[PDB]
């Protein structure tokens, strides 16, 4: 149908906007602490602590399969990156601190993303 195509074009354009958002958030992680999944070879107990691991490469895979239907789903995944880290790592660690800085800096980007998603529909 023509409607299915129109819906698909909307999803494609959301994917375009989310790709730009993801790039801007990942720039706020210059140490690449959140770039890849936590290694279960190096942290063998991780899944005993964290039930839904997340990282920027995993988000990118979902994004490129057009797997985010809306901004809320994408933000859920970004929040998991931060929240998982702040639980597993203590306050005095470079990992925790990196997450706080990512959260604070990402808030600005996500604030305008939400306006753009609503604005452009």
């Amino acid at each position: 149908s023509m409607e299915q195509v129109a819906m698909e074009l909307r999803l494609t354009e959301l994917t375009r906007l989310l790709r730009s958002v993801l790039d801007q958030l990942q720039d706020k992680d210059p140490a690449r602490i959140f770039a890849q999944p936590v290694s279960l070879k190096e942290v063998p107990d991780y899944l005993d602590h964290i039930k839904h691991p997340m990282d920027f490469a995993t988000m990118r895979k979902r994004l490129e399969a057009q797997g985010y239907k809306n901004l809320h789903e994408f933000e859920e995944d970004f929040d998991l990156i931060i929240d998982n880290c702040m639980k597993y790592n203590a306050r005095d660690t470079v990992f925790y601190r990196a997450a706080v800085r990512l959260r604070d800096q990402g808030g600005v980007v996500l604030r305008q993303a939400r306006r753009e998603v609503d604005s452009i529909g």
Side-chain angles (χ1 to χ4, degrees), residues 1-2 4-6 8 11-15 17-40 42-60 62-68 70-110 112-119 121:
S1 78
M2 206 28 252
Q4 289 297 316
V5 172
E8 295 162 356
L11 174 63
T12 297
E13 284 306 302
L14 174 70
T15 306
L17 180 158
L18 298 182
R19 192 177 303 112
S20 169
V21 175
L22 185 62
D23 294 341
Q24 285 177 69
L25 296 172
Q26 188 153 25
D27 291 336
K28 309 314 179 154
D29 175 32
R32 301 192 67 86
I33 289 165
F34 304 104
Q36 294 292 331
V38 169
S39 172
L40 304 176
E42 305 169 358
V43 190
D45 72 357
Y46 189 66
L47 300 183
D48 293 345
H49 290 271
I50 298 300
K51 298 295 166 181
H52 295 101
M54 190 48 54
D55 63 276
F56 288 129
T58 302
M59 294 188 61
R60 197 169 293 280
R62 183 163 166 195
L63 180 60
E64 289 316 329
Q66 297 187 348
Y68 294 115
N70 56 52
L71 185 53
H72 181 76
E73 289 187 349
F74 176 97
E75 293 172 312
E76 284 192 337
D77 273 353
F78 180 64
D79 285 338
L80 273 178
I81 292 176
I82 296 316
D83 291 341
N84 288 344
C85 184
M86 292 176 75
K87 293 169 190 65
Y88 190 82
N89 305 106
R91 218 159 25 253
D92 74 325
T93 60
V94 65
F95 307 106
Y96 186 111
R97 290 163 175 284
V100 166
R101 292 165 59 84
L102 179 61
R103 190 198 61 186
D104 285 352
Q105 296 194 281
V108 181
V109 173
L110 287 170
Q112 206 47 44
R114 160 55 62 204
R115 293 191 67 84
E116 284 171 350
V117 167
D118 294 356
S119 185

